Amino acid sequence: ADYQTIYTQIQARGPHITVSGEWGDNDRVGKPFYSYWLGKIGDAQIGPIYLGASGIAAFAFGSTAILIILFNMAAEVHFDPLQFFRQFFWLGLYPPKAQYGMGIPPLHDGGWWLMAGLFMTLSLGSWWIRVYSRARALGLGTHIAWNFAAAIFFVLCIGCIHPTLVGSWSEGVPFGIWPHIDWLTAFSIRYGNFYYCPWHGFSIGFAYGCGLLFAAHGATILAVARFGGDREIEQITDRGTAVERAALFWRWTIGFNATIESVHRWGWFFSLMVMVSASVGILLTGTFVDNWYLWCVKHGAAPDYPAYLPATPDPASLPGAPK
Amino acid sequence: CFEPPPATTTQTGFRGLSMGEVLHPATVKAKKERDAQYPPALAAVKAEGPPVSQVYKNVKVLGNLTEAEFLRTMTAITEWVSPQEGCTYCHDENNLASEAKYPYVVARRMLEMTRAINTNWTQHVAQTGVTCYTCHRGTPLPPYVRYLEPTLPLNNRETPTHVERVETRSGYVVRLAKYTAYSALNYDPFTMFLANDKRQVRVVPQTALPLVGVSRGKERRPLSDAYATFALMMSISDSLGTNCTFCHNAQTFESWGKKSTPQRAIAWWGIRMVRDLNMNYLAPLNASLPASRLGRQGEAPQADCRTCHQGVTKPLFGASRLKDYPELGPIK
Amino acid sequence: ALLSFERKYRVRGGTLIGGDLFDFWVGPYFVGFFGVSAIFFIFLGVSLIGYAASQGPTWDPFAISINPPDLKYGLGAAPLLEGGFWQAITVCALGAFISWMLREVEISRKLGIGWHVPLAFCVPIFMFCVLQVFRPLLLGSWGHAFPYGILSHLDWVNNFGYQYLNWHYNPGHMSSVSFLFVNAMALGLHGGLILSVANPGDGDKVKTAEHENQYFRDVVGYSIGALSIHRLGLFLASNIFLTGAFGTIASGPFWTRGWPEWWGWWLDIPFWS
Amino acid sequence: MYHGALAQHLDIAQLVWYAQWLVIWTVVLLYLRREDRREGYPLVEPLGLVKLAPEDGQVYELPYPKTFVLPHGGTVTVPRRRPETRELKLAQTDGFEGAPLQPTGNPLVDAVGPASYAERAEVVDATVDGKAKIVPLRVATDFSIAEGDVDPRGLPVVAADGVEAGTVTDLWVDRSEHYFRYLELSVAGSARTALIPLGFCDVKKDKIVVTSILSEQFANVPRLQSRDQITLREEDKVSAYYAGGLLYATPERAESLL
Numbered sequence A: 001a002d003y004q005t006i007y008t009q010i011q012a013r014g015p016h017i018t019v020s021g022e023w024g025d026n027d028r029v030g031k032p033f034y035s036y037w038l039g040k041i042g043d044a045q046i047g048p049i050y051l052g053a054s055g056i057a058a059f060a061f062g063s064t065a066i067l068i069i070l071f072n073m074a075a076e077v078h079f080d081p082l083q084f085f086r087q088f089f090w091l092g093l094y095p096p097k098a099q100y101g102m103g104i105p106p107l108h109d110g111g112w113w114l115m116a117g118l119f120m121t122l123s124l125g126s127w128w129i130r131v132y133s134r135a136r137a138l139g140l141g142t143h144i145a146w147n148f149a150a151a152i153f154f155v156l157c158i159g160c161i162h163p164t165l166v167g168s169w170s171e172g173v174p175f176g177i178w179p180h181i182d183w184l185t186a187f188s189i190r191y192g193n194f195y196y197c198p199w200h201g202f203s204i205g206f207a208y209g210c211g212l213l214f215a216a217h218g219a220t221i222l223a224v225a226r227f228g229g230d231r232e233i234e235q236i237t238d239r240g241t242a243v244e245r246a247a248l249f250w251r252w253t254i255g256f257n258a259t260i261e262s263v264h265r266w267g268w269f270f271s272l273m274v275m276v277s278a279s280v281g282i283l284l285t286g287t288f289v290d291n292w293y294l295w296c297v298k299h300g301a302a303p304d305y306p307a308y309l310p311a312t313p314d315p316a317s318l319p320g321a322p323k
Numbered sequence B: 001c002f003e004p005p006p007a008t009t010t011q012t013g014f015r016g017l018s019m020g021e022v023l024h025p026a027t028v029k030a031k032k033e034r035d036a037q038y039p040p041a042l043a044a045v046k047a048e049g050p051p052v053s054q055v056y057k058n059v060k061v062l063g064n065l066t067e068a069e070f071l072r073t074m075t076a077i078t079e080w081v082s083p084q085e086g087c088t089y090c091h092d093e094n095n096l097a098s099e100a101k102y103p104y105v106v107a108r109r110m111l112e113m114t115r116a117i118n119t120n121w122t123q124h125v126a127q128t129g130v131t132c133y134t135c136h137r138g139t140p141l142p143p144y145v146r147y148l149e150p151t152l153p154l155n156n157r158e159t160p161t162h163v164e165r166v167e168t169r170s171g172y173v174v175r176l177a178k179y180t181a182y183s184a185l186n187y188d189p190f191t192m193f194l195a196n197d198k199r200q201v202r203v204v205p206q207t208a209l210p211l212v213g214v215s216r217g218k219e220r221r222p223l224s225d226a227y228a229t230f231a232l233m234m235s236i237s238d239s240l241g242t243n244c245t246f247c248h249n250a251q252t253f254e255s256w257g258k259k260s261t262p263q264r265a266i267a268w269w270g271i272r273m274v275r276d277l278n279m280n281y282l283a284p285l286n287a288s289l290p291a292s293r294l295g296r297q298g299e300a301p302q303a304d305c306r307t308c309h310q311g312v313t314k315p316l317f318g319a320s321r322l323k324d325y326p327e328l329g330p331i332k
Numbered sequence C: 001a002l003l004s005f006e007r008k009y010r011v012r013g014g015t016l017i018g019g020d021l022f023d024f025w026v027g028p029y030f031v032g033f034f035g036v037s038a039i040f041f042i043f044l045g046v047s048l049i050g051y052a053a054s055q056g057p058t059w060d061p062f063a064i065s066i067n068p069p070d071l072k073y074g075l076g077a078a079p080l081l082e083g084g085f086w087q088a089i090t091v092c093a094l095g096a097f098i099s100w101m102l103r104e105v106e107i108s109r110k111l112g113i114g115w116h117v118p119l120a121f122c123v124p125i126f127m128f129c130v131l132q133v134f135r136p137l138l139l140g141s142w143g144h145a146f147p148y149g150i151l152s153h154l155d156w157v158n159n160f161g162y163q164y165l166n167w168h169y170n171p172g173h174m175s176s177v178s179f180l181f182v183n184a185m186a187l188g189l190h191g192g193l194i195l196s197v198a199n200p201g202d203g204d205k206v207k208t209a210e211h212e213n214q215y216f217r218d219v220v221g222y223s224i225g226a227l228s229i230h231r232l233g234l235f236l237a238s239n240i241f242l243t244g245a246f247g248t249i250a251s252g253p254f255w256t257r258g259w260p261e262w263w264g265w266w267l268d269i270p271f272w273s
Numbered sequence D: 001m002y003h004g005a006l007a008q009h010l011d012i013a014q015l016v017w018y019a020q021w022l023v024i025w026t027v028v029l030l031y032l033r034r035e036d037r038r039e040g041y042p043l044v045e046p047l048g049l050v051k052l053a054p055e056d057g058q059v060y061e062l063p064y065p066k067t068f069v070l071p072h073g074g075t076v077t078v079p080r081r082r083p084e085t086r087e088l089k090l091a092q093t094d095g096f097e098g099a100p101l102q103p104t105g106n107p108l109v110d111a112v113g114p115a116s117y118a119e120r121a122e123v124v125d126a127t128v129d130g131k132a133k134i135v136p137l138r139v140a141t142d143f144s145i146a147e148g149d150v151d152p153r154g155l156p157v158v159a160a161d162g163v164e165a166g167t168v169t170d171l172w173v174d175r176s177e178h179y180f181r182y183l184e185l186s187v188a189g190s191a192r193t194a195l196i197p198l199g200f201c202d203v204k205k206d207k208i209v210v211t212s213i214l215s216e217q218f219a220n221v222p223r224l225q226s227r228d229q230i231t232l233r234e235e236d237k238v239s240a241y242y243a244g245g246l247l248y249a250t251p252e253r254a255e256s257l258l
Ligand code: BCB
Pocket: A195, A200, A201, A202, A204, A205, A206, A208, A209, A212, C046, C049, C128, C131, C146, C150, C151, C153, C154, C157
């Protein structure tokens, strides 16, 4: 077996490299240090970190959002520190419970939620600028930023775009561990079972495919690490036996194959499509479809099944039944 | 952390749909033994003599019974409601027609309520019916009642923690969670849905596309109604010791016909019956109760699904005393 | 027929069974003995699906559903129309999947590469067994397994979840979901990164390994490195099912209540109760 | 009336369903599957004789060429014509189209099958700032073994047959990634040096075990041009040599394990 694919047997140390960027080389703070146990399964060097304007703006806005959330959470346990740790998972900051439409809600019923939403959104935009500009500063393409953009766009969809399209802030995602989980069922119940939303299906198809692709790609590179397949950039520009064997393994298995470069386009595309499909689904939901199951029945797609115990009429529609 | 196998499972939908009950035998046995404490029927007595309307002085509900029949009732009532306290719980030792103790007047209304249940709500209690025991289980205060705010523990026979106490505000989220099967849902399904008939449980649209005029802005129900319905369903499931598939094919929670079991219809009647009981029999009794029975808003204790069911899909696993005590209903 | 670089790799040997008898290609496809068994099982399973589907109500692909037997048949054979076809198809599936895996190890040996890919492919085969074999064994019926249909298998996932009131609170599920999410995120990052170095645009020159690490050190203060991200990605993806299988096996055999209630081990410690 | 309704039983969501499939198949078929073909295409047939005109599908399946501007000068364009020139010492075991080839000589030296190397540039891989990337420690003197880990320098190398075959004299390190990739070893009784990819090395505290080749086979490991640097093609030649041993070191390794 190739033990190098499991962990680094003999680690190496050397002077720390610094690639210069078009700006901000002085905003790298911290002194690098080395972790021997990290170095078994990764690169041993931790830090320094770049510390630009957008990154600080992100930390500023983020912490503001975190603080607004934590304070409202603590209010929910009347500031008892012990119950706060006990009940942490169950605590939350909720959008309005009452229907104000799109009017700004009272602070006690969703205003603080809206506030925390604003500052998180600013934090996401600020970090996006960091992710984008750091690439151009180092003379790299902006591929990560465009993937990250789709992920931010999906959050905005469930956070505020879908609420504004249907016209009620009551539909946003709460802040908190269990409560953001509870939203998923409330939403799916409201809109007629999300299994029958084709864009749920698409998103899941791509999410599962990301698991398929990264398992397959990761396994492939490790299987050709003896020929240096991990050095992918130079295998793109000068095809070595590593990527020839990787390409032929798949070709002989499934009948076709990618290149060392194109496999990353596949992976990038699949990842992006998780978020793009999710967003189309949310954008259609509530605006143009009210019950995804009935929409599938309307178009003849839903499965049906025999009764097992007897079919049961809606009692509310029998004559003389109470309301 | 975990419950050792095997599990008992049942089937409630077409094969391949994963519908049905999942039960831990130990737990079922412990509930079976708790419920087997149901006292057996007192021996039948011969109907003899005049109606007790002519014999006793203050008999307004049970007036058509004979003396032995009526005293048999009174023995059964004491066994079901106040066995440890005895007949003197409701009566003055020296004047059995005195209404001076509040349990007397309450018991009279409870008699009317119980026969109402067995006569007007057969759509829910069928031929099984209820007795005083179904709720009370041998104590004057039933172990599973609800106030207009959640209380812990669920069984009022256990002693509350400082945090469990309703006046400790830091314990509200936990009081609420334990009523909704430990979910973080931020809604009290009892005051929302079971205390009165003001709210609609259904939230799911019955059309594929959104209907213009109910689908935008303030025309829309807030999403919180869906959280609230879900919370009601968590609470209902936990109260019967069962899961959603007992009543629903989760393919379409809102559909009836093949998508619902007959138990879902019975449950629907149960919601209406509990509303009738609370609005018309139990909530008015804050006039007749001491202040130590009332909640922080002067409300009487009221009933939910757990009051009768106590964690079993049929109260007391289907035990019945209807044929043994005709005077409790149904009434022609 | 052949890629420009392929011929020098197309050598004899590396099989596990049969030696020369099946050591050949058909078009791009390597065959081998497990190539043959795979096609056998695929042909058998697809036949049974077709025969079973024709005895059913519809031909709409979204509505076809081959279902397991009623629970009352326990672990026994069930009549073909009411569960038997499901039983037969399931065995063909396992035959096909395992054949496919073993075929990949043969291809791996011939090329002189690691067996990591069939190894990784064991994880989803294992998960399939958890759902269709192991958990139904532990509960005592094939009836607890999921049905074969595009949309019907979602109805089973659906009801299965709601049998425990809110499946999201299943701790094995929480772990599984977290790996699904971070895996999809890492693959975007890894693919994004590689493309960004090889394709800076504008006729600018392609960058370097050191540029790769500089980028992530700058943005998040750490860079795991080229070889390591591939190890991590296999680890992340594999743990979607490796941890998930516990949350699945637990539900029913080792837990019968709702999954929210399970967290009482934390909430109900007397110290802060 | 209904949000999202259109005339004649159409709704918007139904249209988006079609559009979404169209987008997917467009990207997969017209973009990704052509990107997949920037290597190894056009394919090779039993002699493509039509030198006068290309067959239509071969033009259609290819993307427009792209040019990489290399970091230390030069350009690479893909796809491009790159036939494999060198004579392969293989013979067809049958007349069938996809019958396997057999090695006629010694497949490790002849560099066929798992021993094949790619025809990469006879060029030394470079650091960001132009230095040689893969260098032995005698040259890379500011690099050390990390404290904790076996220093293999001095340890013996045991081959598959259990025979000591040489002694590890140096580690080659990747200066770009801070990662050791090869051990250098003197092959006992042959007055030469050989490189070994770490991935073929079982690093124990008293020995380096190497199961891919026999002790005698260390004699014909591809040699380098220079002592203190390596070219990309040499890296391929060296790595491939041991991988070829997995199938060829003994007659029994190519036959079925069962
Ligand atoms: C425990 C939970 C499970 C689950 C939960 C689930 C959900 C919630 C959703 C799906 C969806 C899907 N699932 Mg399903 N599922 C599927 C297959 C499918 C596809 C129909 C679809 C998209 C899959 C995908 O893109 O993956 C990534 C793989 C890729 C991209 C490679 C391509 C695979 C190809 C598209 C699959 C096509 C398979 C054929 C339709 C079936 C084979 C037919 C035979 C005759 C050849 C198979 C083959 C299995 C097996 C063998 O176990 C399986 C098990 C499960 N699914 C478990 C039961 N799955 C989605 C859907 O839209 O269903 C309608 C969906 O929303």
